[PDB]
Each structure stands twice: as structure tokens, then as C-alpha cells.
């Protein structure tokens, strides 16, 4: 079915991935081991000061982590 997960923190998404593969593997389901898609950042380089004292700046990021999980056996014990 290939459910997708994406989250800001990085340990949270691995414990969620092992939660969903735990609730899938404890029932009969031939699920793949969870897939790391590359995790994308984006950059916010910004001026610190309030007036015109430029050429003194600092940057920010935010980093979305993207995993991937797919099941190929729709069973009644793996429904939701």
C-alpha cells in the first residue's frame, strides 16, 4: 500500500516506523523493513541586527525526515 511518514524530529520517526512495523509484523504480514528516503533541509539565512549593520548574519534550517513503509498482503489482521 506504501504508507509514507515524514516528521521533523529524527528519533520520533524511527520509533514510529518501528511502531508501525511492530503492529504490522505481530500480525501475519510480509512487510518490508522500513525504508529511509533522504531527508531534506531548507535554509533561512537572515540578518541578526535591527538596523543596517549588514555583513553579520546567521542561518537557520528545518529538516523533514521521510521514511517509507509498504505492505503487500491485505489481511484481516492488518487492516488499520
Amino acid at each position: 500500500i506504501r504508507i509514507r511518514l515524514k516528521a521533523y524530529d529524527h528519533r520520533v520517526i524511527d520509533q514510529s516506523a518501528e511502531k508501525i512495523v511492530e503492529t504490522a509484523k505481530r500480525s501475519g504480514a510480509d512487510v518490508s523493513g522500513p525504508i529511509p528516503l533522504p531527508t531534506e533541509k531548507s535554509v533561512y539565512t537572515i540578518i541578526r541586527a535591527v538596523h543596517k549593520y549588514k555583513d553579520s548574519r546567521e542561518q537557520f534550517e528545518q529538516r523533514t525526515h521521510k521514511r517509507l513503509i509498504d505492505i503487500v498482503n491485505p489481511t484481516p489482521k492488518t487492516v488499520d
Binding site: T45, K54, D55, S56, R57, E58, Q59
Partner: protein, 127 residues
């Protein structure tokens, strides 16, 4: 018997194999001598073959990826040394006597914020 010689130089991977016979190097279903575009010194990546006391040991039919062209080159030079030492494990004490097998000294670096070319500073006027 030699396989899986990875090779890295400046953001340009290269994976190889080594087949016995004679020295015949080839990448990406086309030649080498008229692929490395300027690079008249094609022989100077074959130069570990020069210093391993034997030139025509094996054939390669190698693979390469990414980077520039000499950034895409010169890692084949690195990449056949790992599999070359995996062909016979004697050569670490006898290929690192010219110091050749592995060094990853340098890649490009960050443009420092409020500068122009990552070590250069803009010109300040006077006093």
C-alpha cells in the same frame, strides 16, 4: 581474483571490477583514450600498474559516475588500488612505500557568510 574496488575523488564515485588477462581499461560501454577529454596523461592513472612491478596483470571494464571529468577521473586511479590489494593482500606493505593507496585530502568548502569566495574577503576602502 579482484572485485568491488570503490574509488572516490571530489564527489565522483567509481566502482570497478578486475578480470584476469591483460591490461585493457574501459568505462561506460566506450573507450578511455578518447573519453578523458583533455587528459593526455591517461597513462598516469595507470601508474599504480607502473609501481606494482607489473603492467599487464588484469583487465578492468570499469564503471564511473558523477563529478567533472578529471574529478571523474583520478579516482579510477584510487579505485583499482583497493581491488588490486584485494587481488593479493601483500601489496599494502608494498604499495604504500610510494604512498598511494588511499587519501581523501580535500573537497570544496562552504561560502562563508558575508564573504565572496569562501576564503576571500571583500575589499575595504581606506583610512
Amino acid at each position: 581474483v579482484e572485485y568491488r574496488g570503490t574509488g572516490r575523488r571530489k564527489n565522483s564515485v567509481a566502482r570497478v571490477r578486475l578480470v584476469p588477462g591483460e591490461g585493457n581499461i574501459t568505462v561506460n560501454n566506450r573507450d578511455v583514450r578518447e573519453y578523458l577529454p583533455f587528459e593526455s596523461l591517461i597513462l598516469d592513472l595507470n601508474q599504480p600498474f607502473d609501481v606494482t612491478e607489473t603492467k599487464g596483470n588484469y583487465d578492468v571494464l570499469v564503471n564511473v559516475h558523477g563529478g567533472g571529468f578529471t574529478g571523474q577521473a583520478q579516482a579510477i586511479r584510487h579505485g583499482i588500488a583497493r581491488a588490486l590489494l584485494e587481488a593479493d593482500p601483500e601489496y599494502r606493505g608494498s604499495l604504500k612505500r610510494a604512498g598511494l593507496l588511499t587519501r581523501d585530502p580535500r573537497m570544496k568548502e562552504r561560502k562563508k557568510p558575508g564573504l565572496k569566495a569562501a576564503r576571500r574577503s571583500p575589499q575595504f576602502s581606506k583610512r
